[PDB]
C-alpha cells in the first residue's frame, strides 16, 4: 500500500577530492529528505513541508545516520577498489537502497537491503530477510561480515518494528500529500506522419502516484510490440506525466483504443481519437 525508501549514492572523484555522498528518502513517490556531503552545512534537510515540524532529536538522528553511512561508504569505496584490483585513477560508484513496504493492515509486505557497485548488483537481502545473495566472489566478503555480525536479524527487527512505525508517522503528518491518489487526465492526440500514416499518442497527465499502465489495442487485440512509451516524468508540482504512441494506417484510426489503468481511477478508462 505504501513504501518508505532510503537511497544513497557514493561517487569517488580521483584527484578532485574525497567521494561525494548524496542520500534521499521517499515515502512512495514523494521525496521528503535529502543529504549532500558537498553542502556547506552537510545535514539532513527537509524536502517537504510536513517533515519540517520534527523536533531537534529527529534532525540529529537523521543527520546522524546520514553522516555515518557517508563514512561507511567512503571506506567501502576504497576497500572495493582494492578487492577488485582496480586503478586508483578511475571513478567508481556505490549505491544502496533500504526500506519497507507496508500493507493496508499495517504489516510488512517486503523489506529491502541492497547495494550496487558501478551500477551492477553487489549484495542484497533475500525475501526471508534471514539471508543474503552475493553477486560475485568479492561480495562474499561482505556476506561473511554480515553473517558474523548477525546483521540480517538486526535489520529485520528495524524493518518489522521501526520502519513501519516511521512510515505510519509520515503518512499521518503528510496525510494530505501522501495519502492522495490523483487520477490521470487522459486524451488522445493525432499526428499524421505521412499521407498514408499517422501517430496516435495517448496522454496521461496530473496523476499520482507515478505507477500507471497505458496500452493500445487494435480491434481489442493489444499492440505490445508496436507501442512506443516514454519514461514516466514528473511535472514538478507533485504529479506525473506519461504517454504511449502507436503508428496506425490513415483512415483506420477508429480500430484503435487506448486503455488507462491507474490506482486513482474508480476503474480503467478506454479512449478513442475523437475527430
Amino acid at each position: 500500500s505504501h513504501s518508505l525508501r532510503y537511497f544513497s549514492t557514493a561517487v569517488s572523484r580521483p584527484g578532485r577530492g574525497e567521494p561525494r555522498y548524496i542520500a534521499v528518502e521517499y515515502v512512495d513517490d514523494t521525496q521528503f529528505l535529502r543529504f549532500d556531503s558537498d553542502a556547506a552545512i552537510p545535514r539532513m534537510e527537509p524536502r517537504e513541508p510536513w517533515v519540517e515540524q520534527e523536533g531537534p532529536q529527529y534532525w540529529e538522528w537523521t543527520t546522524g545516520y546520514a553522516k555515518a553511512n557517508a563514512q561507511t561508504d567512503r571506506v567501502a569505496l576504497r576497500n572495493l577498489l582494492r578487492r577488485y584490483n582496480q586503478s586508483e585513477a578511475g571513478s567508481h560508484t556505490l549505491q544502496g537502497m533500504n526500506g519497507c513496504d507496508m500493507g493496508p493492515d499495517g504489516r510488512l509486505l517486503r523489506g529491502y537491503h541492497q547495494h550496487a557497485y558501478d551500477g551492477k548488483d553487489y549484495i542484497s537481502l533475500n525475501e526471508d530477510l534471514r539471508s543474503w545473495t552475493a553477486a560475485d566472489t568479492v561480495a562474499q566478503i561482505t556476506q561473511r561480515f554480515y553473517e558474523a555480525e548477525e546483521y540480517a536479524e538486526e535489520f529485520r527487527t528495524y524493518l518489522e518494528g521501526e520502519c513501519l512505525e516511521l512510515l505510519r508517522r509520515y503518512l499521518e503528518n503528510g496525510k494530505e500529500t501522501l495519502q492522495r491518489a490523483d487520477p490521470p487526465k487522459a486524451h488522445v492526440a493525432h499526428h499524421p506522419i505521412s499521407d498514408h500514416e499517422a501517430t496516435l499518442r495517448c496522454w496521461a497527465l496530473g496523476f499520482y502516484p507515478a505507477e500507471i499502465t497505458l496500452t493500445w489495442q487494435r480491434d481489442g487485440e493489444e499492440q505490445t510490440q508496436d507501442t512506443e512509451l516514454v519514461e514516466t516524468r514528473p511535472a514538478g508540482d507533485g504529479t506525473f506525466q506519461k504517454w504511449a504512441a502507436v503508428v496506425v494506417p490513415s483512415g483506420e484510426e477508429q480500430r484503435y483504443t487506448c486503455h488507462v489503468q491507474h490506482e486513482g481511477l474508480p476503474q480503467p478508462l478506454i479512449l478513442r481519437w475523437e475527430q
Partner: peptide
C-alpha cells in the same frame, strides 16, 4: 547515530 554497515 546508526544505520547500515558495508564491509
Amino acid at each position: 547515530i546508526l544505520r547500515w554497515e558495508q564491509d
